[PDB]
Amino acid sequence: MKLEINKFNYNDPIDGINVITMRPPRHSDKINKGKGPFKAFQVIKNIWIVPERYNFTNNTNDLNIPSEPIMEADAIYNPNYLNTPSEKDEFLQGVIKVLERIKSKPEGEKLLELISSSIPLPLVSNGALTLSDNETIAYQENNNIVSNLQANLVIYGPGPDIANNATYGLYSTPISNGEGTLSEVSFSPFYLKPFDESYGNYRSLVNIVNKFVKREFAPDPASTLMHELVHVTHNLYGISNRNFYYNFDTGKIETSRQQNSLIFEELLTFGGIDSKAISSLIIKKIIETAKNNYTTLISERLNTVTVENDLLKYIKNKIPVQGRLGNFKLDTAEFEKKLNTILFVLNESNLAQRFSILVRKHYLKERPIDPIYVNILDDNSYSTLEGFNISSQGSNDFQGQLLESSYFEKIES
Ligand SMILES: [Zn+2]
């Protein structure tokens, strides 16, 4: 069946199929006592949009201006953002539009299909793969749980910094042991952080001889979301590399941060020039770790399954195996191929190239640039097929991302 995106208006009635009131996945944490439930919309099978601010972790629980020293000088705060029905509908439409954009190229469509289908490896109960809260969200009505519906990804609005974007895996052992975990994403389609890149096709003073200089650009929020979707994919496969750092001075992996280092999960997820000279030692170790984790799960869990149900079908589609019920083995060659796709081929920089989107050269930015607001729902500014770089308007070849474009609106900070 061809992937379609379900459209919604925020005021669409609850149906228990695609429109629910969702209990927070992190409801058991003390900081989330009494929160929700929140209206949620199933945009793609197992992918839900919740038009609420993300405030469900320690670092996102307070939406006010931080009481500590600020981590990012390009952050912008507004505790009231996304508290009205009209802002919630705008957000919902924006996320849907960005997803339609992503689906409009085969690489983006395949990414969405992968997230939809790649359920975490369930626990086994009475010989059957059986769902947990690591693979579902609860539809809560009047302090009763009506149903538990499958979910691999829940997309929310931003946390405290309304121009920040992030991914959170639900359970921290499954995120890295090969099982996989439901992910939450905090996403901001309308508030964007600019970046610098060298460029030559812009209005320039006649007295400047050499026109190719660093210029300011806005990112395409589809690229921003795809970046998070790559983290989500790692999280669903249980292959997150959050607890390793790559040291650019030595070219080695380290367990703790160093002066000129980057978290390895971000190095891979962003891609680009910085991932082109990773050592064979590093790549071999990463592959071996994942292979070992999967071999262990196939032995200790998958081979305890005695009941063939739909969850087993979905898991066999996710995890390349050979053999029969009770005696599966990892399909080494197919697993390696799939792993190397998800780790080394799937990344923001490669995806952006396929979408004709400009991204920055390095994951880490050299300087903060004040965030902007842009109404991406206006097709004159941002289209599903071309983003900001609209050919019929003369904005192809990255020109539509130039920050001087009128649709990138200054924020009073
Ligand atoms: Zn990232």
Author numbering: 1 to 413
Which sentences from the paper describe this structure?
A new serotype of BoNT with unique substrate specificity was recently identified from the genome sequence of C. botulinum strain 111, and designated BoNT/X17. Remarkably, BoNT/X is the first and only BoNT member that can cleave additional VAMP family proteins, VAMP4, VAMP5 and Ykt6. LC is a zinc-dependent endopeptidase, while HC is composed of two functional domains that are responsible for translocation (HN) and receptor binding (HC). Despite only ~30% identity at the amino acid levels with other BoNTs, the overall structures of LC/X present a fold similar to other BoNTs with largely conserved secondary structural elements.
In the first form, data from a single crystal were collected up to 1.35 Å resolution and the structure of LC/X was solved using molecular replacement with LC/B as a template. Residues 1–413 were clearly defined, however no electron density was observed for the N-terminal tag and the C-terminal end (414–439), all in solvent-accessible areas. The active site of LC/X has the overall conserved geometry shared with other BoNTs. The Zn2+ ion is coordinated by the triad His227, Glu228 and His 231 and a fourth coordination provided by a water molecule linked to Glu266. The water molecule provides the nucleophile base required for the proteolytic activity. Deeper within the cleft, residues 160–165 form a β-strand that borders the catalytic channel, with the S sub-pocket delineated by residues 235–242. On the other end, the S’ sub-pocket delimited by loops 192–195 and 360–365 is well conserved, and may help stabilise the interaction with the C-terminal end of the substrate upon binding. In addition to loop 195–217, a major difference was observed for one of the loops involved in SNAP-25 binding by LC/A known as loop-2507, which in LC/X makes a three-stranded β-sheet arrangement from residues 243 to 263 and extends away from the catalytic channel, in a structural feature unique to LC/X. Loop-250 was shown to take on a different conformation in LC/A where it went from an open configuration in its free form to a closed configuration upon substrate binding.
